[PDB]
Ligand binder design. Sequence first.
Ligand SMILES: *[C@@H]1O[C@H](CO)[C@@H](O[C@@H]2O[C@H](CO)[C@@H](O[C@@H]3O[C@H](CO)[C@@H](O)[C@H](O[C@H]4O[C@H](CO)[C@@H](O)[C@H](O)[C@@H]4O)[C@@H]3O)[C@H](O)[C@H]2NC(C)=O)[C@H](O)[C@H]1NC(C)=O
Ligand SMILES: *[C@@H]1O[C@H](CO)[C@@H](O[C@@H]2O[C@H](CO)[C@@H](O[C@@H]3O[C@H](CO)[C@@H](O)[C@H](O[C@H]4O[C@H](CO)[C@@H](O)[C@H](O)[C@@H]4O)[C@@H]3O)[C@H](O)[C@H]2NC(C)=O)[C@H](O)[C@H]1NC(C)=O
Ligand SMILES: *[C@@H]1O[C@H](CO)[C@@H](O[C@@H]2O[C@H](CO)[C@@H](O)[C@H](O)[C@H]2NC(C)=O)[C@H](O)[C@H]1NC(C)=O
Ligand SMILES: *[C@@H]1O[C@H](CO)[C@@H](O[C@@H]2O[C@H](CO)[C@@H](O)[C@H](O)[C@H]2NC(C)=O)[C@H](O)[C@H]1NC(C)=O
Ligand SMILES: *[C@@H]1O[C@H](CO)[C@@H](O[C@@H]2O[C@H](CO)[C@@H](O)[C@H](O)[C@H]2NC(C)=O)[C@H](O)[C@H]1NC(C)=O
Ligand SMILES: *[C@@H]1O[C@H](CO)[C@@H](O[C@@H]2O[C@H](CO)[C@@H](O)[C@H](O)[C@H]2NC(C)=O)[C@H](O)[C@H]1NC(C)=O
Ligand SMILES: *[C@@H]1O[C@H](CO)[C@@H](O[C@@H]2O[C@H](CO)[C@@H](O)[C@H](O)[C@H]2NC(C)=O)[C@H](O)[C@H]1NC(C)=O
Ligand SMILES: *[C@@H]1O[C@H](CO)[C@@H](O[C@@H]2O[C@H](CO)[C@@H](O)[C@H](O)[C@H]2NC(C)=O)[C@H](O)[C@H]1NC(C)=O
Ligand SMILES: *[C@@H]1O[C@H](CO)[C@@H](O[C@@H]2O[C@H](CO)[C@@H](O)[C@H](O)[C@H]2NC(C)=O)[C@H](O)[C@H]1NC(C)=O
Ligand SMILES: *[C@@H]1O[C@H](CO)[C@@H](O[C@@H]2O[C@H](CO)[C@@H](O)[C@H](O)[C@H]2NC(C)=O)[C@H](O)[C@H]1NC(C)=O
Ligand SMILES: *[C@@H]1O[C@H](CO)[C@@H](O)[C@H](O)[C@H]1NC(C)=O
Ligand SMILES: *[C@@H]1O[C@H](CO)[C@@H](O)[C@H](O)[C@H]1NC(C)=O
Ligand SMILES: *[C@@H]1O[C@H](CO)[C@@H](O)[C@H](O)[C@H]1NC(C)=O
Ligand SMILES: *[C@@H]1O[C@H](CO)[C@@H](O)[C@H](O)[C@H]1NC(C)=O
Ligand SMILES: *[C@@H]1O[C@H](CO)[C@@H](O)[C@H](O)[C@H]1NC(C)=O
Ligand SMILES: *[C@@H]1O[C@H](CO)[C@@H](O)[C@H](O)[C@H]1NC(C)=O
Ligand SMILES: *[C@@H]1O[C@H](CO)[C@@H](O)[C@H](O)[C@H]1NC(C)=O
Ligand SMILES: *[C@@H]1O[C@H](CO)[C@@H](O)[C@H](O)[C@H]1NC(C)=O
Ligand SMILES: *[C@@H]1O[C@H](CO)[C@@H](O)[C@H](O)[C@H]1NC(C)=O
Ligand SMILES: *[C@@H]1O[C@H](CO)[C@@H](O)[C@H](O)[C@H]1NC(C)=O
Ligand SMILES: *[C@@H]1O[C@H](CO)[C@@H](O)[C@H](O)[C@H]1NC(C)=O
Ligand SMILES: *[C@@H]1O[C@H](CO)[C@@H](O)[C@H](O)[C@H]1NC(C)=O
Ligand SMILES: *[C@@H]1O[C@H](CO)[C@@H](O)[C@H](O)[C@H]1NC(C)=O
Ligand SMILES: *[C@@H]1O[C@H](CO)[C@@H](O)[C@H](O)[C@H]1NC(C)=O
Ligand SMILES: *[C@@H]1O[C@H](CO)[C@@H](O)[C@H](O)[C@H]1NC(C)=O
Ligand SMILES: *[C@@H]1O[C@H](CO)[C@@H](O)[C@H](O)[C@H]1NC(C)=O
Ligand SMILES: *[C@@H]1O[C@H](CO)[C@@H](O)[C@H](O)[C@H]1NC(C)=O
Ligand SMILES: *[C@@H]1O[C@H](CO)[C@@H](O)[C@H](O)[C@H]1NC(C)=O
Ligand SMILES: *[C@@H]1O[C@H](CO)[C@@H](O)[C@H](O)[C@H]1NC(C)=O
Ligand SMILES: *[C@@H]1O[C@H](CO)[C@@H](O)[C@H](O)[C@H]1NC(C)=O
Lengths: 113, 119, 116, 438, 442
Amino acid sequence: FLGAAGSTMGAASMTLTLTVWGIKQLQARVLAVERYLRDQQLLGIWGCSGKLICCTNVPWNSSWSNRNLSEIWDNMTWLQWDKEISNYTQIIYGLLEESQNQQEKNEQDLLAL
Amino acid sequence: GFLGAAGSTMGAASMTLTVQARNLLSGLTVWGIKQLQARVLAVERYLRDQQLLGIWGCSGKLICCTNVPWNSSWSNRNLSEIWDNMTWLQWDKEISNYTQIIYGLLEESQNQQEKNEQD
Amino acid sequence: GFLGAAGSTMGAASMTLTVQARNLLSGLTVWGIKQLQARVLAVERYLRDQQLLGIWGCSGKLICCTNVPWNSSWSNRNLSEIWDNMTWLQWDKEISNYTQIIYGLLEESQNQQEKN
Amino acid sequence: LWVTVYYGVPVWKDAETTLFCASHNVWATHACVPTDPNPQEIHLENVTEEFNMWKNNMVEQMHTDIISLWDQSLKPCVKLTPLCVTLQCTNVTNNITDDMRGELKNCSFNMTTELRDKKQKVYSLFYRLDVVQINNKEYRLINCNTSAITQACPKVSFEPIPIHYCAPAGFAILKCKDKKFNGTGPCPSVSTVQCTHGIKPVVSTQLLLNGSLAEEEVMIRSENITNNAKNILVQFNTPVQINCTRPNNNTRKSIRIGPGQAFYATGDIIGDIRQAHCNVSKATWNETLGKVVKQLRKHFGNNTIIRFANSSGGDLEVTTHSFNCGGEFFYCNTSGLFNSTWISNDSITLPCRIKQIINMWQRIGQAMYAPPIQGVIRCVSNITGLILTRDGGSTNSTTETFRPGGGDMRDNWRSELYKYKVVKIEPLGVAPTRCKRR
Amino acid sequence: NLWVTVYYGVPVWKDAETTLFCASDAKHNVWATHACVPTDPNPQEIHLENVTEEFNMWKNNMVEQMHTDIISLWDQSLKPCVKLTPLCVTLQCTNVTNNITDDMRGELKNCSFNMTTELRDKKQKVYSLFYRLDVVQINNKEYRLINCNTSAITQACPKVSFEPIPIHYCAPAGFAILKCKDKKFNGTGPCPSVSTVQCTHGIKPVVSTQLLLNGSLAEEEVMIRSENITNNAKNILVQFNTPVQINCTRPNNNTRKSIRIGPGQAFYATGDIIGDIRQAHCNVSKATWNETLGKVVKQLRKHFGNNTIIRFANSSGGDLEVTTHSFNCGGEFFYCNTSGLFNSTWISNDSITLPCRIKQIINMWQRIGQAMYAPPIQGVIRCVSNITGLILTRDGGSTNSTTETFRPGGGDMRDNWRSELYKYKVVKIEPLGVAPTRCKRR
Ligand SMILES: *[C@@H]1O[C@H](CO)[C@@H](O[C@@H]2O[C@H](CO)[C@@H](O[C@@H]3O[C@H](CO)[C@@H](O)[C@H](O[C@H]4O[C@H](CO)[C@@H](O)[C@H](O)[C@@H]4O)[C@@H]3O)[C@H](O)[C@H]2NC(C)=O)[C@H](O)[C@H]1NC(C)=O
Ligand SMILES: *[C@@H]1O[C@H](CO)[C@@H](O[C@@H]2O[C@H](CO)[C@@H](O[C@@H]3O[C@H](CO)[C@@H](O)[C@H](O[C@H]4O[C@H](CO)[C@@H](O)[C@H](O)[C@@H]4O)[C@@H]3O)[C@H](O)[C@H]2NC(C)=O)[C@H](O)[C@H]1NC(C)=O
Ligand SMILES: *[C@@H]1O[C@H](CO)[C@@H](O[C@@H]2O[C@H](CO)[C@@H](O)[C@H](O)[C@H]2NC(C)=O)[C@H](O)[C@H]1NC(C)=O
Ligand SMILES: *[C@@H]1O[C@H](CO)[C@@H](O[C@@H]2O[C@H](CO)[C@@H](O)[C@H](O)[C@H]2NC(C)=O)[C@H](O)[C@H]1NC(C)=O
Ligand SMILES: *[C@@H]1O[C@H](CO)[C@@H](O[C@@H]2O[C@H](CO)[C@@H](O)[C@H](O)[C@H]2NC(C)=O)[C@H](O)[C@H]1NC(C)=O
Ligand SMILES: *[C@@H]1O[C@H](CO)[C@@H](O[C@@H]2O[C@H](CO)[C@@H](O)[C@H](O)[C@H]2NC(C)=O)[C@H](O)[C@H]1NC(C)=O
Ligand SMILES: *[C@@H]1O[C@H](CO)[C@@H](O[C@@H]2O[C@H](CO)[C@@H](O)[C@H](O)[C@H]2NC(C)=O)[C@H](O)[C@H]1NC(C)=O
Ligand SMILES: *[C@@H]1O[C@H](CO)[C@@H](O[C@@H]2O[C@H](CO)[C@@H](O)[C@H](O)[C@H]2NC(C)=O)[C@H](O)[C@H]1NC(C)=O
Ligand SMILES: *[C@@H]1O[C@H](CO)[C@@H](O[C@@H]2O[C@H](CO)[C@@H](O)[C@H](O)[C@H]2NC(C)=O)[C@H](O)[C@H]1NC(C)=O
Ligand SMILES: *[C@@H]1O[C@H](CO)[C@@H](O[C@@H]2O[C@H](CO)[C@@H](O)[C@H](O)[C@H]2NC(C)=O)[C@H](O)[C@H]1NC(C)=O
Ligand SMILES: *[C@@H]1O[C@H](CO)[C@@H](O)[C@H](O)[C@H]1NC(C)=O
Ligand SMILES: *[C@@H]1O[C@H](CO)[C@@H](O)[C@H](O)[C@H]1NC(C)=O
Ligand SMILES: *[C@@H]1O[C@H](CO)[C@@H](O)[C@H](O)[C@H]1NC(C)=O
Ligand SMILES: *[C@@H]1O[C@H](CO)[C@@H](O)[C@H](O)[C@H]1NC(C)=O
Ligand SMILES: *[C@@H]1O[C@H](CO)[C@@H](O)[C@H](O)[C@H]1NC(C)=O
Ligand SMILES: *[C@@H]1O[C@H](CO)[C@@H](O)[C@H](O)[C@H]1NC(C)=O
Ligand SMILES: *[C@@H]1O[C@H](CO)[C@@H](O)[C@H](O)[C@H]1NC(C)=O
Ligand SMILES: *[C@@H]1O[C@H](CO)[C@@H](O)[C@H](O)[C@H]1NC(C)=O
Ligand SMILES: *[C@@H]1O[C@H](CO)[C@@H](O)[C@H](O)[C@H]1NC(C)=O
Ligand SMILES: *[C@@H]1O[C@H](CO)[C@@H](O)[C@H](O)[C@H]1NC(C)=O
Ligand SMILES: *[C@@H]1O[C@H](CO)[C@@H](O)[C@H](O)[C@H]1NC(C)=O
Ligand SMILES: *[C@@H]1O[C@H](CO)[C@@H](O)[C@H](O)[C@H]1NC(C)=O
Ligand SMILES: *[C@@H]1O[C@H](CO)[C@@H](O)[C@H](O)[C@H]1NC(C)=O
Ligand SMILES: *[C@@H]1O[C@H](CO)[C@@H](O)[C@H](O)[C@H]1NC(C)=O
Ligand SMILES: *[C@@H]1O[C@H](CO)[C@@H](O)[C@H](O)[C@H]1NC(C)=O
Ligand SMILES: *[C@@H]1O[C@H](CO)[C@@H](O)[C@H](O)[C@H]1NC(C)=O
Ligand SMILES: *[C@@H]1O[C@H](CO)[C@@H](O)[C@H](O)[C@H]1NC(C)=O
Ligand SMILES: *[C@@H]1O[C@H](CO)[C@@H](O)[C@H](O)[C@H]1NC(C)=O
Ligand SMILES: *[C@@H]1O[C@H](CO)[C@@H](O)[C@H](O)[C@H]1NC(C)=O
Ligand SMILES: *[C@@H]1O[C@H](CO)[C@@H](O)[C@H](O)[C@H]1NC(C)=O
């Protein structure tokens, strides 16, 4: 649990696997359920459900980050990477959703004939 | 944005499913308890819809194709006046009568498919 | 209806999985939190069962087929009278002790079937 | 053979959970969830379930809920803290009968007003069981050294309302449909239900009233029939009608004891005063006791002499048949019922007494004052059961004595929750099959 | 051949009733805006083209929710405060005649009484200034408070403010708020211009009668709205185009005294006024009121006839809350006589002064058994407000009546917030749909 926080990105990619107290317990339970469901739904709408590493169909725009693959997976940590592309997360998230919807429509069209 | 394609045709609004999909889960005092039951209710409604989708074989999909033929007694309009001359809000008012029949048909069909595939 | 095939054999009870799989999710005063905590507990139990199914790679299915062999040390009965002269209530009592270890096996094989 | 996973198997285990309702009054049936108009019930074929009447958690939950509802209904009512004063009391005369000499007392005292400066001088009629004499004479209220009385709000009604207890999602209620079930052991005929039937929380002692009747024969139940420390519950084949009345024409006075607080006192009876009582039939009771004796001899031989004697010892609630007839709390003497011996038209009248300061649920520290009810009161009810106890007659006792008991209200609702149990559904199973994953 | 196809996320909705929560802009206030979740800096409103919805102003669950929430907050904010039970005693009152004017004689009483101390066996003799509306004579003369035979008073906590704060009403997940953007909508029927929002705009819970203050204004025309216009038992809500400024003042220079009536229990009495004594009053402009009344008459002539003459009159009968314009200048409760406003007839610089009175024992929400004592406010007070609407009532003139008479109304605060929630409705999302397609599952 959080054991690869100081390793490179590539190394970490291999290991991704009432009363006062009674009121406080219930809020924690609700928060945990909410977070789990939100993450599962976000993964699902991208077509990445059931996977830990998922390949998408959206090309990488060089304006998000112009570094080479050698100084990303062998020179940074995920905490360092998160600081760079934090401004572009929602753009990529919308692009993934549009791409998956197009795939659904294309599959329907293929089954139509 | 959200519900922006509410007046668009059934074909043009079928490409905006993900917009409405994500705005369904997160999108002691007087104000204290009015906020917790809201969260629990949203979670239960989302889970009920997800289970309904899952027991039809359409789990984790936005558009899903079924083996149930379209009974003409439900509606007789051709496809040229459904996906191009109608809206989902206008389409629901017509077929609101026959929804549960279709739901039962889908459930039985998916269960039969699983039963004969495992055999 | 609900729990209708309780006394019916294991073969005939496999055709009614949805009638019970559907009723596991729906049905500050004295009756204030007795409702809320029960609702949260039901949600948590349903979610836990869903994750347990997902671990073995059976998420989304009612009947799931697995590659783990049935060791001849849990039940020596043959596959004739089990599905024709027995019920789920009687079956659960016999193999209740060997369940937890099987839940291990059912997991591991799955990842191997992905690793291969 | 290979392991195959099924989700949706019909398996269950014994469990324990909190059940909710399905239904001005003490029991807030308007806040409990609405009842389904269609009773849903599934008969279960070729299954037998073991039941235990004497270890049902539904009884404990019902007890706790009834007590909590009682406590909650008493919060917004008037607190009679200025009532604990010295009272000057005199005997009541002027057309009182022989059997009512010394039961009513005319007590005068000083009382607070709506203004903090001045006091009034008022009077009221009290029952002898409510006042303790301290050194005409001077008295005080019986509860002024143990608790603080709260005046029951006069608008609420004490009449019980049927309540249905429902199980949450993932839980089921199983019912034993056997008509000769004795509450413990296997049950062949089983069904599953959503909610229990309409159960009225009727509070009484020594006698079960307004309940349910046995279908074919009188039922006799106990945790250990050969142990004398266990109460014996008897369920009737047919009910016995009982007529209870208090023939006094009362009045109610209102006294302003504070800025917004009123005390409801007793005025003067318009007319003659007489004793409250209850009537039962004689032939019907004789036949019912004969049936109970016939069903009792299956455990104590066919040659033992079976005799019924009255109670012995304890507080007024335990030694008397105590109930509540339309707002007024009755305590009746039942020595004309349990007085007989059985070897190998007219009426029976039970004289009753009335109280107004009530300690419910066997609690010390909380009391309630019941305001007087105007006019005459009358109510008709069904006896549908008994609660007996057996004394330990040793030294070669060929005779058995059964005397009425009670006092603990859990045995009252244990006689209505005895064919019910709560189970948890376990929907995931594994089985050997002749197929394999590809 | 056609087959059923399932779509998840379709834009469909239905009518629903749900629990809406509160949002306020990011401390002691009656409506606990500090416990409300913060509001986003810019709202997300989505205009919905090609869709027409149906609205009804008079069956809206938001009004009932707002009423219940306001009453609950009011009750919750009064629990930890001082119970004035020992104040129900016999008072010895005399008339106040010291630098007073002839229009304010007999309205103030100087009352002396005996009071409890911090020590359970001691008494004190104290005095206070009371209003004539708060004391009843019993048999100088002796008096008592207005409430000693009906209820028990609770002193308002003096650190709690009565000023309204804007409130936003938000919907849970799976719900939306439809907002009508038409200009000539009377609040009933089809609205051909709709948007969707997550929270309503800022609404101030102002409690007043006969006059709506600090509200919202109509954009093009003066709007007359009634549930059943031909029924004379229904109130008429009038919404203005431009506001009318009203200036209200209580000129007395009040002094506050603290009397210790128990261990850690204080009673805030009124001392002596420093200076002269004068009547509280409000001022409106005459020309602006005449313009507004002419516009109201012109817009009311579209419902009753081309030629009918329209006249206004003052209220008639009822308790002082409903026969007068009742409001609150930040701590002090005013009851003003609006008789020079509704006095005119119409056929087809200067100021108007409204004398007001002050009460100190308040029964809110038309309830009985729970009264409240408002502690005096130190110094001169002055609040400036906008009139933005009216609540009217029509007389049932039969027998060939060519004249229609309108009189001010009010008393029920559901109509005060019905005028702010008239363009909003709450809808529930149904994201599951089934449609026919040639596609077949393989
Ligand atoms: C066993 O069940 C029987 C039958 O239900 C029951 O007898 C009933 O008792 C109730 C309550 O005492 C009686 O109802 C009253 O009857 C008369 C006539 O209506 C009135 O005195 C009462 O109305 C006044 O009081 C009400 C109190 O809430 C007020 O709401 C109302 O406005 C009136 O002021 C009240 O209706 C009922 O008549 C009898 N029924 C019969 C057939 O006798 C009996 O009490 C139960 N036994 C036990 C032990 O609980
Ligand atoms: C309609 O809106 C107008 C404009 O907002 C509003 O008038 C405002 O009233 C409030 C409340 O009386 C005024 O605020 C007060 O003004 C002065 C100077 O600041 C002081 O008396 C007050 O401060 C004291 O009181 C506070 C009470 O909470 C204490 O917290 C504070 O520490 C001080 O003791 C207070 O600030 C405000 O100035 C006026 N605004 C104008 C422009 O006149 C009017 O009341 C609204 N109408 C209705 C009917 O609600
Ligand atoms: C209870 O005692 C009171 C007095 O304490 C009796 O009421 C008085 O009766 C006399 C005789 O008729 C009247 O002259 C008085 O006016 C009555 N009132 C008072 C306040 O003294 C009352 O009759 C007695 N009641 C009973 C049942 O004996
Ligand atoms: C209980 O039974 C007694 C005895 O039968 C009843 O008392 C009789 O009442 C009638 C009028 O109803 C009188 O004419 C008789 O004189 C009474 N008999 C006696 C011996 O006093 C009494 O009314 C019955 N009460 C009820 C509630 O049924
Ligand atoms: C219940 O009633 C019986 C009689 O039915 C009472 O027993 C009588 O008590 C009196 C004194 O009150 C004695 O003089 C009699 O001899 C007793 N009679 C019999 C037949 O034994 C009994 O006391 C009553 N119970 C009470 C009052 O608690
Ligand atoms: C209200 O009455 C009080 C007394 O009850 C007045 O206060 C007194 O005023 C006189 C005359 O100036 C002084 O001699 C006393 O010392 C004051 N105090 C007391 C406790 O007697 C007060 O002036 C009156 N107020 C008004 C407005 O008339
Ligand atoms: C509390 O006292 C007030 C004031 O005396 C009462 O109001 C009077 O009620 C009587 C009832 O007969 C009327 O005739 C008077 O006209 C009322 N006076 C005023 C000034 O309104 C009030 O009724 C009392 N309340 C209660 C609950 O007793
Ligand atoms: C009362 O009405 C006046 C006049 O319309 C409003 O004052 C305007 O406020 C806006 C918003 O701040 C300013 O842009 C305008 O310039 C103001 N107008 C004038 C003429 O000064 C005022 O906001 C209204 N509301 C209240 C609560 O006073
Ligand atoms: C309300 O209007 C009245 C009348 O115009 C104002 O009273 C005048 O006040 C001025 C000082 O501001 C005095 O010089 C005048 O003598 C007063 N006139 C009268 C007839 O008494 C009053 O000030 C206004 N009040 C407010 C709050 O605006
Ligand atoms: C409101 O004020 C008006 C005047 O502005 C009052 O009407 C006057 O009442 C007095 C007696 O109070 C009469 O002498 C006058 O003749 C009335 N004037 C007119 C023009 O009719 C009215 O009574 C006040 N409303 C109240 C006090 O409730
Ligand atoms: C991200 O946005 C923030 C806020 O505007 C800005 O300060 C920061 O420089 C941005 N970073 C990049 C890499 O664009
Ligand atoms: C509204 O309808 C018009 C006319 O049919 C169409 O051109 C337009 O795209 C529609 N707009 C939306 C948002 O659906
Ligand atoms: C008065 O009451 C007392 C106390 O119960 C009783 O013993 C006595 O007999 C009565 N005497 C008279 C004369 O009423
Ligand atoms: C009531 O007060 C009076 C007057 O002080 C006194 O004589 C009497 O003893 C008091 N008590 C009573 C009547 O019980
Ligand atoms: C209260 O008084 C009664 C009557 O004298 C007495 O029996 C009882 O013991 C007292 N209770 C307590 C708790 O002192
Ligand atoms: C109830 O019957 C069972 C057998 O079904 C028996 O074991 C038990 O003792 C009986 N209970 C009695 C007689 O109280
Ligand atoms: C009492 O018994 C009678 C006769 O059997 C029956 O009609 C009635 O329903 C029973 N219950 C009550 C509450 O009266
Ligand atoms: C029942 O009571 C008898 C007599 O006391 C005792 O010997 C026996 O063990 C009891 N039975 C059970 C099952 O406890
Ligand atoms: C009780 O007395 C009152 C007053 O005289 C009378 O109206 C009423 O009928 C009486 N009640 C009876 C006789 O049941
Ligand atoms: C009880 O009263 C009813 C009428 O209410 C009467 O028919 C019946 O005979 C009475 N029963 C007895 C035992 O007196
Ligand atoms: C029981 O009856 C006996 C004999 O008549 C009597 O002494 C005793 O007081 C009675 N007890 C009760 C509780 O009725
Ligand atoms: C008990 O029964 C006996 C025998 O008939 C009788 O003498 C006695 O009076 C009865 N006791 C009562 C009715 O209290
Ligand atoms: C206060 O108490 C005194 C002394 O008892 C008394 O004379 C006076 O009337 C009481 N009331 C007042 C001052 O209102
Ligand atoms: C509001 O306008 C509609 C037309 O959109 C009309 O039907 C309705 O009667 C009007 N309401 C009134 C005049 O109160
Ligand atoms: C009120 O009186 C106080 C105390 O003398 C003074 O400071 C203040 O200025 C006065 N307020 C006025 C005259 O408005
Ligand atoms: C109200 O007071 C303001 C200043 O606060 C002034 O400009 C305005 O003219 C006044 N209005 C009236 C109607 O007196
Ligand atoms: C208001 O206008 C009307 C209509 O012109 C006029 O009769 C009346 O005098 C005016 N009121 C004024 C100027 O106060
Ligand atoms: C009333 O007269 C006005 C004058 O502008 C006119 O516009 C309106 O149409 C008339 N109302 C009718 C004809 O109903
Ligand atoms: C209304 O005005 C009339 C006449 O001016 C007056 O007598 C009456 O008291 C007034 N009513 C109110 C409630 O102000
Ligand atoms: C109402 O208006 C009339 C006509 O101008 C006037 O005589 C009367 O005094 C007014 N009433 C008021 C201001 O109360």
